[PDB]
Amino acid sequence: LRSRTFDSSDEVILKPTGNQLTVEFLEENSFSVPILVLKKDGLGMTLPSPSFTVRDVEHYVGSKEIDVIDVTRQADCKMKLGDFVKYYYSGKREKVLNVISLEFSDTRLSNLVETPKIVRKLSWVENLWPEECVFERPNVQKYCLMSVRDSYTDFHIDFGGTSVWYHVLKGEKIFYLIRPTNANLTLFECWSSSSNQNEMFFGDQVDKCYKCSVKQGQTLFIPTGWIHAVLTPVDCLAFGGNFLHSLNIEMQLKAYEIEKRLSFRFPNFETICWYVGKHILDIFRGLRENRRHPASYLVHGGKALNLAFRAWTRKEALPDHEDEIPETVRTVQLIKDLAREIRLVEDIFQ
Ligand SMILES: O=C(O)CCC(=O)C(=O)O
Ligand SMILES: [Fe+2]
């Protein structure tokens, strides 16, 4: 409804050029803060022209049951796309409706859009989800967002501890961003499992809340665990996607364990972790045999990953986690091997 007074993000949010946004760039900073890229050149995307409209979204997706958020009544419902488009172009919208969950990769719209290059290089699903396995591949890579003026999504952490990119093709979005310190995470879990949670503005409860506007042609990358709300001050059309990566594995697991203690979720999160575990073990093995040392974040990440592996497979917890373990993973052997590799890197006597 109204935008107020927010703490300065000058020392927090990074604004590199598209070309500066590389893996090494992220590795040097740990992908700890949101990243706003003002111009799309260098990001490696493919996008429809800025003249591409919501009317064209209906064309490629089909007049499709899409999930719609009733902002005004704070509730979730379903609509045909043609009905939403019709609503979107009405000069007398009675209510405030928001579409944020239209995943379009299995539709015709999918070949008009290519996601940022950094995302595809980092993404666990993209690179490490196997062709052949009993599980369904998680499909959370291409979303079409259609937000009317005065749309609002309250403070949340993205499902599965994912990181996210958003490109605004038309209009504007304003993100309200809170760093996932242990304190803020505690306050968030407290706020999220509270009764009348949706009466209290979470940005009041915390040390610092940053506001970041994302205008036409701009691209925002939000890292793991960052608590964010979104206001749409002008009718908006945006594309975005969600991804897991190896830069802060502990934070991904922490976000996932919060989502568990509350209750919408990254499908087969634990499955991809198990496959990532096997891969990380190979990376450690390859580096030691090559007489090189792994980067610090990978040692820390493998450690956190191995802690979760043990927690998921201990006797009291196993019934809740067994269904997610791939049949090609020897749980005990992987835990043992990951632990040995990590101990070898860290033991001062070798
Ligand atoms: O665009 C919106 O209103 C919500 C974006 C967001 O933070 C999300 O979908 O996770
Ligand atoms: Fe989000």
Residue 173, annotated as binding a ligand: yes
Same domain, 2 and 43: yes
Q: How was this structure determined?
A: X-ray
Structure tokens at 290: 């090559």
CA of 87 to the centre of ligand 2 (A): 24
Judge contact between 174 and 213, C-beta under 8 A.
yes
Please tell me the distance from the alpha carbon of residue 220 to that of residue 205, in angstroms, as a whole number: 24
Are residues 300 and 251 part of one domain? Answer: no
Domain endpoint, select from 251, 266, 281 = 266
Atom of ligand 1 nearest to the CA of 98: 3
Q: Which of 140, 164, 169, 231 to mutate to test the pocket of ligand 1 (most atoms within 8 A of CB)?
A: 164
The helix (run of H) or strand (run of E) holding residue 53 is: none
Of 117, 161, 144, the C-alpha closest to 272 is: 161
Question: Residue 153, annotated ligand binder?
Answer: yes
d(CA 230, CA 187) in angstroms, rounded, equals 19
Indicate the residue type of 322.
Answer: E
* Of the residues 236, 266, 296, the one at which a domain ends: 266
Cα distances (Å, whole numbers) of residue 139 to 88, 241, 243? 26, 9, 10
131 & 222 share domain: yes
Q: What is the resolution of this structure in A?
A: 2.1
Pair (275, 228) in one structural domain = no
- Assign residue 72 the CATH number of its domain: 2.60.120.650
Whether 158 has a binding-site annotation, put simply, is yes
Separation of alpha carbons 121 and 163, rounded Å? 13
57 and 159 within one domain: yes
From 213, 248, 266, the end of a domain falls on 266
Which residues' Cβ are closer than 6 Å to ligand 1? 98, 100, 145, 147, 151, 153, 158, 173, 228, 230
Tokens representing 315 are 């006797």
- How far the first Cα of the chain sits from its last, in Å, is 60
292 and 229 co-located in one domain: no
Q: Which ligand is nearest to the CA of 229?
A: 1
For residue 102, report the distance from its CA to the centre of ligand 2, in Å.
Answer: 13
Any idea what the Cα angle at residue 155 is, between residues 150 and 156, rounded to 5°? Answer: 125
Sign for the pseudo-dihedral over CA of 184, 186, 189, 191: negative
- Kindly state whether residues 64 and 191 are assigned to the same domain: yes
How far apart, in whole angstroms, are the C-alpha atoms of residue 106 and residue 68?
19
Q: C-alpha dihedral over 233, 238, 241, 246, to 10 degrees?
A: -60
Domain range enclosing 329:
267-350
| Centre of ligand 2 from the C-alpha of residue 157, in Å | 6
* CATH number of the domain enclosing 337: 1.20.58.1360
Same domain, 303 and 226: no
Q: Where are the alpha helices (DSSP H) in the chain?
A: 23-29, 54-61, 81-88, 117-122, 124-128, 182-192, 249-262, 269-289, 296-313, 331-346
Give the number of domains in the chain: 2
Q: How far is the CA of 227 from the centre of ligand 2 (A)?
A: 8
Whether residue 124 is found in the same domain as residue 138: yes
